[PDB]
Amino acid sequence: GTILWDGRFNDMTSSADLNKWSWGNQVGPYQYYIHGSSPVSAYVNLSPDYKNPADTGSRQGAKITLDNTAYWNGQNMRRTELIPQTTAAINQGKVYYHFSLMRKDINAPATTREHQIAFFESHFTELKSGWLSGAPGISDTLLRWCVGGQTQWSVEWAADVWHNVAYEIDFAAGTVGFWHSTGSDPLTRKVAPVKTSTSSNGADWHVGVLELPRSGYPDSNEDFYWSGVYIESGSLTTSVAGPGQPIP
Question: What are the Cα distances from residue 200, in Å, to 92, 145, 167, 235?
Fold first, then answer.
């Protein structure tokens, strides 16, 4: 394996380091600009308590928050997103996109609203949660993996459960496969590569969350926990602790 880009925050002391990035000085591992009017500590906070405990490859996890001010560029959807800052060829050939996600019951994401998570700008693949369409119902509490907007896999999204994911993307063939595990277990392929328009410039993977509005549902704080975010090529690391760490 080979890590093309590391988004595990290991060289950051706190989320304040995200402020070092700017269009005129694109330093660090993440572009930080898709957020609301408040300071970064309103939206992103790092702590060892916010990561998958089995992931010894990540020192701290990030709590990503949507609050009443999480609106970017005058849009009506709430968003707090980080984009990889890299020169690596993360959008060519076969690449694996990793991330671990967890929600708690406190400030839990609203099941009445659609959330788009860890999505590419064209939305060719992403996770989704909440009430998407039709009548409200049992499916609204599901965490789903979508390709071209169509759900290909889903699972009940329980509190305190860490979901480890790797999108297996072949940008040459235009296919995306899904690797997943919960907790400390190794990633296994749960959906063979699915065909879709995989078009990306490499500066368009949104690590974070977008939540659509829904009539009659006011904003309340929503917290999402993330760890183990990185991109690798040539060989998938199935260990949730990442490359170079002992396998749990």
Answer: 9, 18, 14, 21
